[PDB]
Amino acid sequence: SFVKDFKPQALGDTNLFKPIKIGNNELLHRAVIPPLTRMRALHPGNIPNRDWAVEYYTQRAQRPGTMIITEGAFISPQAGGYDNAPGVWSEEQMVEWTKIFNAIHEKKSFVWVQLIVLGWAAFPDNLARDGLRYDSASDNVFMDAEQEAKAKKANNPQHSLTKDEIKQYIKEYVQAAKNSIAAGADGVEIHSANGYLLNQFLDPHSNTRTDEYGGSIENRARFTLEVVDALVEAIGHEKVGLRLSPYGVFNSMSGGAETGIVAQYAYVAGELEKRAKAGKRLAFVHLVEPRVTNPFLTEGEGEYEGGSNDFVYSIWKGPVIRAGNFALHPEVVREEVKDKRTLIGYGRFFISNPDLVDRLEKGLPLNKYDRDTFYQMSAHGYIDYPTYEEALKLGWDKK
Amino acid sequence: SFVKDFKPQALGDTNLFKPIKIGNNELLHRAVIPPLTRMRALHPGNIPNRDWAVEYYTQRAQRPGTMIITEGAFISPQAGGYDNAPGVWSEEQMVEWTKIFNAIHEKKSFVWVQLIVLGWAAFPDNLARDGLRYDSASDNVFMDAEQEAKAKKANNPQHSLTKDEIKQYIKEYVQAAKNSIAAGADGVEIHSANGYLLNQFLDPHSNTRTDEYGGSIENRARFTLEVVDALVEAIGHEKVGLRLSPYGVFNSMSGGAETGIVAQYAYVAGELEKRAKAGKRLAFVHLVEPRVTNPFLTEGEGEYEGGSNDFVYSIWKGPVIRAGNFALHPEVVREEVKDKRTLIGYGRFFISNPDLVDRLEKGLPLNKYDRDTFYQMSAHGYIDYPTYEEALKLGWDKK
Numbered sequence: 037s038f039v040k041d042f043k044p045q046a047l048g049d050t051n052l053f054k055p056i057k058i059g060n061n062e063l064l065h066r067a068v069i070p071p072l073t074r075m076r077a078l079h080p081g082n083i084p085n086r087d088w089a090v091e092y093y094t095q096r097a098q099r100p101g102t103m104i105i106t107e108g109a110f111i112s113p114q115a116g117g118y119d120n121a122p123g124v125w126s127e128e129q130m131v132e133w134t135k136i137f138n139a140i141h142e143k144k145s146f147v148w149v150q151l152i153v154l155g156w157a158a159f160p161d162n163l164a165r166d167g168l169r170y171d172s173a174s175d176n177v178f179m180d181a182e183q184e185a186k187a188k189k190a191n192n193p194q195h196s197l198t199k200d201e202i203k204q205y206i207k208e209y210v211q212a213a214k215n216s217i218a219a220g221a222d223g224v225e226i227h228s229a230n231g232y233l234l235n236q237f238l239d240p241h242s243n244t245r246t247d248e249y250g251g252s253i254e255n256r257a258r259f260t261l262e263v264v265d266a267l268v269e270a271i272g273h274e275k276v277g278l279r280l281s282p283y284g285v286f287n288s289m290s291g292g293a294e295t296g297i298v299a300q301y302a303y304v305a306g307e308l309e310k311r312a313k314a315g316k317r318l319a320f321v322h323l324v325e326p327r328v329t330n331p332f333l334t335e336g337e338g339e340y341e342g343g344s345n346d347f348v349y350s351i352w353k354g355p356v357i358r359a360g361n362f363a364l365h366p367e368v369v370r371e372e373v374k375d376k377r378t379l380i381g382y383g384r385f386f387i388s389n390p391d392l393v394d395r396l397e398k399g400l401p402l403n404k405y406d407r408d409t410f411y412q413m414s415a416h417g418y419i420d421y422p423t424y425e426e427a428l429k430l431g432w433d434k435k
Numbered sequence: 436s437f438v439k440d441f442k443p444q445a446l447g448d449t450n451l452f453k454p455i456k457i458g459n460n461e462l463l464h465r466a467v468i469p470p471l472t473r474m475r476a477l478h479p480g481n482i483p484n485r486d487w488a489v490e491y492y493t494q495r496a497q498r499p500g501t502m503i504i505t506e507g508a509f510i511s512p513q514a515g516g517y518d519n520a521p522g523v524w525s526e527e528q529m530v531e532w533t534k535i536f537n538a539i540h541e542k543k544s545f546v547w548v549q550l551i552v553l554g555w556a557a558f559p560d561n562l563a564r565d566g567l568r569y570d571s572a573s574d575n576v577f578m579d580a581e582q583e584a585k586a587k588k589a590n591n592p593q594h595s596l597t598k599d600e601i602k603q604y605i606k607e608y609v610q611a612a613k614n615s616i617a618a619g620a621d622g623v624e625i626h627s628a629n630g631y632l633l634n635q636f637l638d639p640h641s642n643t644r645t646d647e648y649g650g651s652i653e654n655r656a657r658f659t660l661e662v663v664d665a666l667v668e669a670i671g672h673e674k675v676g677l678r679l680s681p682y683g684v685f686n687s688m689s690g691g692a693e694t695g696i697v698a699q700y701a702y703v704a705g706e707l708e709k710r711a712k713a714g715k716r717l718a719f720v721h722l723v724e725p726r727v728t729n730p731f732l733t734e735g736e737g738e739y740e741g742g743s744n745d746f747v748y749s750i751w752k753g754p755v756i757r758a759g760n761f762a763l764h765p766e767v768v769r770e771e772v773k774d775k776r777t778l779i780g781y782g783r784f785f786i787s788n789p790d791l792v793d794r795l796e797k798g799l800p801l802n803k804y805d806r807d808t809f810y811q812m813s814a815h816g817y818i819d820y821p822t823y824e825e826a827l828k829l830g831w832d833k834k
């Protein structure tokens with residue numbers, strides 16, 4: 037069915053429908069697909085779904101000139117810990133990714149691989165089974181009671197990374213980025229948001245290290261910026277973006293309750309702008325909005341009103357993608373896109389609307405999403421959401 | 436004469452005319468007099484002007500419930516270097532300050548002493564004459580060619596403060612604050628703006644130290660926060676405010692050209708909010724706006740459009756005073772005061788309009804200021820600017 041209490045607005049008369057260049061890609065509009073984990077990858081081997089993933093991405097690439105950021109992809113086995121999320125370290129994985137990239141490109145759209153390392157969000161019991169560590173910045177604070185329980189049962193203790201192990205992850209980021217580009221991707225996004233490993237280093241709650249990787253703003257940002265620099269050198273600044281969620285609390289990050297949080301993220305933004313003036317400007321910075329501090333709460337919940345991401349614009353002078361509860365708020369998007377370097381990521385409603393871009397342009401009703409199939413091993417709630425045409429044929433306008 | 440090309444607007448229907456409590460003071464409106472050096476203090480001894488200073492402040496206290504921040508006052512001889520700016524270290528000084536405070540209080544207004552230390556802005560030749568050092572954070576970067584010339588001639592080299600000398604300044608801040616309160620002031624403002632000594636420590640251009648007072652965000656902020664803590668302990672958090680100018684370039688500060696500048700100031704704001712949650716909230720943070728990056732450029736010049744101070748509001752949750760080109764822009768003030776913890780500092784137009792508050796309320800013409808008498812040793816351009824009533828009697832409406 038369509039979302040019941042929603043008054044659509046056509047956005048075709050706004051900058052959302054003005055072309056913009058991001059890295060090497062000439063986007064034809066500024067509605068971006070942000071990274072969305074769907075858990076259809078197959079075990080063993082963290083292989084992109086051989087039955088459905090091409091179709092899923094093809095559907096969502098249908099509007100020409102759309103920028104798609106993939107679901108997060110593990111850079112290595114040690115970086116993972118969910119059996120049904122994909123990786124980008126193996127030949128068998130890359131064979132499937134290449135088909136996905138080719139399909140997106142045939143629709144004249146673009147694809148950026150999000151590179152992920154889980155840290156304390158990983159399942160310690162899956163990792164123990166595979167003879168892998170359970171990693172984080174520190175070993176004296178733990179994500180939550182369920183993770184604690186899983187770790188006790190699996191007898192797999194949270195492990196504070198050594199400097200050598202940080203370097204090994206950096207090597208893996210580099211190879212994963214190279215694999216992605218060689219397989220046909222337009223670029224990569226470094227995930228430093230949502231409470232995964234890089235965020236665990238940025239955040240003073242999860243990072244209580246006393247070496248050069250913790251204990252100050254500069255030190256907490258070190259790992260993230262090392263990955264940035266390593267990938268810029270490996271594949272080019274124009275093929276690299278960075279994702280941040282300054283106000284996020286998902287996976288036990290501090291958000292606005294930490295009074296130093298703006299400073300921490302302002303520092304990162306400043307260091308990116310320094311590199312940009314020095315000839316190496318990232319393709320984009322991607323921000324999760326305080327509109328959504330936890331993406332598994334229904335739209336309107338988990339809003340933080342005590343802070344804004346606008347500070348980033350005073351510092352970083354490149355493109356900015358913003359995501360978080362924008363689909364149901366065209367009135368907000370209309371204002372935000374007046375800034376000529378702002379793009380809008382639409383997550384949950386791109387799950388449920390393969391033709392979302394057409395619907396945004398024309399002010400059409402939106403398909404409701406089905407949270408029960410966000411992570412299911414099924415084609416249902418993955419590739420069977422209808423376009424607007426299909427929805428009308430199905431009688432959804434009278435449901 | 437009145438300002439010729441200005442269309443006044445009455446602001447009496449806005450929050451500018453709603454009462455607010457700042458520290459111990461019940462302000463009746465939110466038009467604040469920011470600190471304005473006038474150079475009428477007498478030499479020797481840096482004594483507030485015995486002929487005119489009481490009258491000057493009395494005039495500008497005339498609207499009941501006005502918050503007045505004094506001209507900057509030196510905490511010690513070593514902190515000074517201008518012969519005609521006042522100090523707050525001596526009995527002879529405090530005798531005059533007490534008369535000033537009493538006069539302001541008789542008008543049912545309030546007075547906060549701004550405490551200053553010049554650093555590299557001081558005149559090296561005056562200091563040499565008095566057997567004093569020429570101080571800054573570092574000794575390998577210098578303010579400008581004129582200061583260099585003065586230092587060479589006076590044979591008084593720029594000196595990088597030792598840690599012991601920083602401690603001595605802190606002792607002096609404490610005694611100056613105590614002197615101010617004991618003499619009758621309602622509070623003090625710590626000047627950490629406009630390129631004076633504390634700002635010279637905050638800014639990475641002027642601070643190239645490799646000890647604990649430089650080389651990182653936390654270290655560059657150390658001196659400012661030490662002064663904050665020392666004064667909070669000495670006279671109470673409710674009697675202390677802090678002034679900052681993140682985007683200022685006056686006295687050779689970096690402003691927005693430094694990509695780390697927002698992070699630096701965001702850190703300070705965060706550390707103030709941390710103290711506030713821990714039971715010691717400063718009375719206010721006072722910000723100079725990027726509207727005015729150098730206060731000796733005519734309104735509209737030296738505007739920096741690449742940055743906003745709005746970031747401070749995401750971090751610091753107390754009152755914020757904002758200053759910079761607001762007198763000629765009532766349309767901007769009308770929007771800014773919709774925020775219920777925002778006050779507006781009016782500098783140059785309070786120099787020229789002793790009854791500025793009445794004029795803001797009622798939308799009256801403003802007296803032009805005379806920059807030639809900003810720093811003159813004269814009553815002219817100090818205590819002879821007319822109220823609106825006096826200006827009409829003088830025929831200014833037909834000039």
Ligand SMILES: Cc1cc2nc3c(=O)[nH]c(=O)nc-3n(C[C@H](O)[C@H](O)[C@H](O)COP(=O)(O)O)c2cc1C
Nearest residue numbers: 070071072073107108331359360361382383384410
């Ligand atoms: C099912 C689901 C999966 C997600 N997967 C990822 C991910 O792999 N990487 C990431 O950075 N964010 C991920 N997110 C967060 C989204 O990219 C996005 O920021 C968030 O959903 C808010 O935007 P929205 O309100 O438009 O849905 C996910 C969100 C959802 C709901």
Ligand SMILES: Cc1cc2nc3c(=O)[nH]c(=O)nc-3n(C[C@H](O)[C@H](O)[C@H](O)COP(=O)(O)O)c2cc1C
Nearest residue numbers: 469470471472506507730758759760781782783809
């Ligand atoms: C003549 C003059 C003297 C000033 N003296 C001081 C001072 O002692 N301390 C300070 O922090 N700022 C000082 N300032 C800066 C002002 O407080 C204020 O921030 C600035 O003039 C911008 O506001 P305006 O546009 O309303 O004049 C001075 C400015 C002027 C023009």
Ligand SMILES: C=C(C)[C@H]1CC=C(C)C(=O)C1
Nearest residue numbers: 073108109121152230331
């Ligand atoms: C497993 C992952 C790759 C994603 C899970 C959900 C969110 C919000 C992420 O950021 C990462």
Ligand SMILES: C=C(C)[C@H]1CC=C(C)C(=O)C1
Nearest residue numbers: 472507508520551629730
């Ligand atoms: C001599 C001083 C006390 C003031 C001089 C001018 C400005 C803008 C200040 O901030 C300080």
Ligand SMILES: [Cl-]
Nearest residue numbers: 038039040041
């Ligand atoms: Cl609904």
Ligand SMILES: [Cl-]
Nearest residue numbers: 117118119120
């Ligand atoms: Cl799993």
Ligand SMILES: [Cl-]
Nearest residue numbers: 217270271272
């Ligand atoms: Cl490449």
Ligand SMILES: [Cl-]
Nearest residue numbers: 437438439440
């Ligand atoms: Cl004029």
Ligand SMILES: [Cl-]
Nearest residue numbers: 516517518519
């Ligand atoms: Cl002088």
Ligand SMILES: [Cl-]
Nearest residue numbers: 616669670671
């Ligand atoms: Cl006291």
Ligand SMILES: [Mg+2]
Nearest residue numbers: 406408409417
């Ligand atoms: Mg169902």
Ligand SMILES: [Mg+2]
Nearest residue numbers: 805807808816
């Ligand atoms: Mg004259």
Ligand code: NA
Nearest residue numbers: 037406417420
């Ligand atoms: Na259905």
Ligand code: NA
Nearest residue numbers: 044045046399
């Ligand atoms: Na419409």
Ligand code: NA
Nearest residue numbers: 086087088415
């Ligand atoms: Na099938």
Ligand code: NA
Nearest residue numbers: 075332410411
């Ligand atoms: Na789950």
